[PDB]
């Protein structure tokens, strides 16, 4: 019966299996070189040694090796914009430390890991930490009690435990008891707990954490700066290996046009994959520069001029008249009645007749659906406020040119 199966699931005795394919997967020898480049340029394929993150690797490795060898416990906070190699470098450090512990060069340790965005409440961190120790799924009150009995009571031989906490800003709330508990347990001498906390903003400990939590969080911090155009090219030409599938100027264009916007590594490794997919359907074996140009135009999209050009005739007269009412009144927020007056003026100039204000309200709702304009519910006709979401110069670029 499924209820016994769920009681086995909460006990952790039955593996959460997933369905298997009926057909065997494709072999590596059948793949083309463009296909090998497209599967090496994936963002899920992490390298064993990350390029251009050697100094941060040395910093986190020296920190965690020192806290393991001294058997003391403490805390760390690494930060940076997304895509900058934080979680990959931290898990690479911990994989290197576990390889050292399996070769008896380091004392053995436990590695628990949670994520702030994989939880439905911040209180479920107690459930997910305790699940990775025993396997049992319990309530968060009993899990909190068992974790406090584990960490606050001295019991030789306690093994060192390393708790990585991704997305620390989600574990914060108003009361801040979960983050206080996770950063307060290293302060006790009975707990050999080393906490690494990953978040995005650099000033998270002073912005939204309290004073005692910022005191416990320490000052041993690391920042992951965004990738420059040299580093973000080195990453992609490391992923390609020794292959000659990509031109040298194409990767330089990808790095120069991604590093100027965000410094994300996922953005570059997705634009190069899209360029490979463009070069595949063009029946060529190399990814030249115009394939990268088409991929850069597709991924970094700007499709509001295409929407205004493909609007209907009455929609374009309405879009001209909202900008005319903005120019006339000066303010950016216009009521529907002045817009309809300018609509009838522009339609009288253009030689067309316009629909009545009901179908004009339908046009306003249709443009507000595309978010070309911002408009209210149509229950307040003739007095609803109409913001112009597109700029007024894009309308004149689309309807003249």
């Amino acid at each position: 019966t499924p209820s016994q199966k769920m009681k086995k699931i909460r006990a952790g005795e039955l593996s959460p299996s997933m369905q298997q394919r009926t057909d065997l997967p494709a072999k590596d020898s059948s793949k083309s070189e463009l296909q090998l480049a497209r599967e090496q340029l994936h963002v899920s394929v992490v390298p064993k040694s990350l390029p251009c993150r050697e100094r941060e690797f040395e910093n986190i490795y020296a920190f965690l090796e020192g806290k393991i060898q001294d058997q003391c416990g403490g805390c760390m906070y690494v930060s940076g914009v997304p895509g900058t190699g934080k979680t990959a470098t931290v898990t690479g450090v911990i994989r290197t430390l576990q390889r050292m512990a399996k070769q008896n060069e380091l004392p053995a340790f436990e590695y628990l890991e949670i994520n702030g965005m994989r939880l439905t409440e911040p209180r479920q961190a107690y459930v997910q930490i305790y699940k990775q120790l025993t396997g049992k799924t319990v309530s968060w009150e009993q899990a909190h009690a068992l974790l406090e009995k584990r960490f606050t009571t001295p019991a030789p031989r306690r093994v060192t435990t390393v708790l990585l906490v991704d997305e620390l800003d989600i574990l914060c709330n108003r009361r801040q008891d979960v983050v206080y508990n996770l950063l307060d347990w290293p302060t006790k001498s009975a707990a050999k707990l080393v906490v690494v906390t990953i978040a995005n903003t650099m000033d998270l400990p002073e912005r939204l954490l309290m004073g005692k939590v910022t005191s416990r969080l320490g000052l041993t911090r690391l920042t992951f700066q965004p990738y420059s155009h040299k580093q973000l090219q080195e990453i992609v030409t490391a992923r390609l290996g020794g292959s000659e599938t990509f031109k040298g100027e194409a990767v330089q264009l990808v790095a120069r046009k991604v590093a100027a916007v965000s410094g994300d590594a996922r953005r570059a490794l997705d634009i190069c994959r899209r360029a490979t997919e463009i070069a595949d359907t063009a029946a060529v074996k190399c990814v030249t520069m115009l394939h990268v140009q088409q991929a850069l135009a597709e991924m970094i999209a700007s499709a509001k001029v295409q929407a205004i050009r493909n609007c209907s005739r009455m929609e374009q007269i309405f879009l001209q008249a909202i900008a005319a009412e903005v120019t006339r009144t000066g303010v950016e927020e216009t009521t529907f009645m002045g817009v309809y007056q300018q609509v009838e003026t522009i339609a009288a100039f253009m030689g067309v007749t316009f629909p009545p204000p009901g179908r004009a309200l339908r046009l306003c709702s249709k443009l507000g659906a595309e978010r070309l304009i911002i408009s209210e519910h149509s229950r307040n006709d003739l007095f609803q406020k109409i913001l112009l979401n597109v700029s007024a110069d894009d309308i004149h670029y689309a309807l003249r040119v």
Partner: protein, 398 residues
């Protein structure tokens, strides 16, 4: 199709084009329905009764499953889905459980069967203007319920408004708008004359008066009476129920020179203009205590007489707000007997508030602290009637 239209045209005169359009769209059950119909009109144009008769006739003659709602009883969406799935999946009993829109669509998808039986579903949602004041995924889902359930169904909406009051920030699907125009004078005369046989059979049951009744109560007599009735009553209302309800009583008053023995238009044109003054009242002297009367006229003088003027009047557009201290000051100014403040006077203030003769425009959480503001909610004629029954003139203090 033609059986439904041939059945509905007797009961609904002057609506042949609307019945014909609804028979074009959702008449036959074998042909596919449009995703939604929105018929609208004024009050009394017959959109609840026509869709009820259409849904009953379709469920009688064909394989359709109908569901007529009212959006006022559906204060949350679970009520609407429970009525909808009770009607569209009948004989489910007390085992029916609907949680949300997803479970409603998932249980409606199971109702699909083979195409040999030609089944359909029809949903009429009366008073559809309430759907925009609820959970904001009800009206977008109901306009595409045929696409979601992959089933031959139509969602009819009934309101007094155009569909241009219904567009929201997210956009809506296509709808087939239909108009029920209100009748002119000739169509309303035909509707009022369609029950001439029911009128004659009611009057023949209610003995010289019966033999003078049946010799002339005929078609042209009732048509001329309805002509004289609509000559004075069509100016104020075109509502067919109010005109029927007033025409019955005015016929009961009009028959008397014919029963007892032009030449009738004046004798009814008296009572016709007496009964015109009580249109929209559907009917088939406020005594108060003495200090309640003084407190009520003091509240009227406080709400009317421009509180800067109270220095000149008492020391010896909208109704203005006043505090309880100003009301008691005007009470002690106009009383001229100086009764002491007790429990019963301020209790009379509170029970005049509870009788809706006064009201609380502001405050109402701090009635005792002096920051509460009241306003009087009566007219001058009632105040003058109170001043007549008291002996205190108000127009000197006005």
């Amino acid at each position: 199709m033609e059986a439904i239209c041939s059945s509905l045209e007797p009961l609904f005169p002057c609506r042949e084009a609307a019945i014909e359009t609804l028979g074009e769209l959702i008449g036959d059950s074998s042909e596919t329905y449009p995703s939604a119909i929105y018929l609208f009109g004024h009050s009394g144009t017959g959109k609840t009764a026509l869709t009820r008769a259409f849904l009953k006739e379709c469920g009688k003659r064909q394989n359709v499953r109908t569901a007529h709602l009212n959006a006022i009883e559906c204060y949350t969406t679970k009520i609407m889905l429970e009525i909808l799935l009770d009607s569209l999946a009948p004989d489910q009993g007390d085992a029916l459980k609907v949680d949300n829109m997803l479970d409603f669509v998932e249980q409606l998808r199971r109702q699909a069967a083979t195409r040999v039986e030609d089944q359909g579903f029809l949903i009429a949602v009366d008073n559809a203007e309430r759907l925009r004041d609820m959970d904001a995924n009800v009206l977008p889902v109901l306009l595409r319920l045929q696409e979601l359930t992959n089933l031959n169904l139509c969602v009819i909406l009934l309101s007094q408004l155009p569909f241009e009051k219904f567009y929201n920030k997210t956009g809506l699907s296509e709808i087939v708008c239909l108009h029920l125009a209100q009748y002119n004078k000739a169509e309303t005369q035909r509707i009022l004359g369609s029950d001439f046989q029911q009128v004659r059979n009611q009057l023949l049951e209610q003995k010289k008066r019966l033999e003078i009744c049946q010799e002339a109560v005929t078609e042209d007599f009732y048509n001329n009476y309805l002509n004289l009735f609509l000559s004075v009553f069509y100016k104020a209302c075109r509502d067919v129920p109010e005109l029927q309800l007033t025409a019955r009583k005015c016929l009961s008053t009009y028959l008397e020179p014919v029963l007892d023995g032009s030449r009738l238009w004046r004798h009814i044109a008296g009572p016709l203009r007496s009964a015109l003054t009580q249109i929209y009242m559907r009917i088939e002297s406020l005594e108060l205590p003495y200090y309640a009367k003084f407190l009520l006229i003091a509240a009227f003088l406080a709400s009317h007489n421009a509180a800067k003027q109270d220095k000149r009047l008492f020391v010896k557009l909208g109704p203005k707000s006043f505090s309880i201290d100003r009301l008691l000051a005007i009470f002690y100014a106009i009383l001229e007997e100086k009764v002491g403040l007790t429990c019963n006077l301020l209790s009379q203030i509170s029970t005049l508030v509870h009788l809706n003769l006064l009201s609380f425009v502001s405050g109402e959480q701090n009635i005792m602290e002096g920051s509460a503001r009241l306003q009087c909610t009566i007219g001058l004629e009632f105040v003058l009637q109170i001043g007549k029954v008291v002996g205190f003139n108000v127009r000197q203090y006005l």
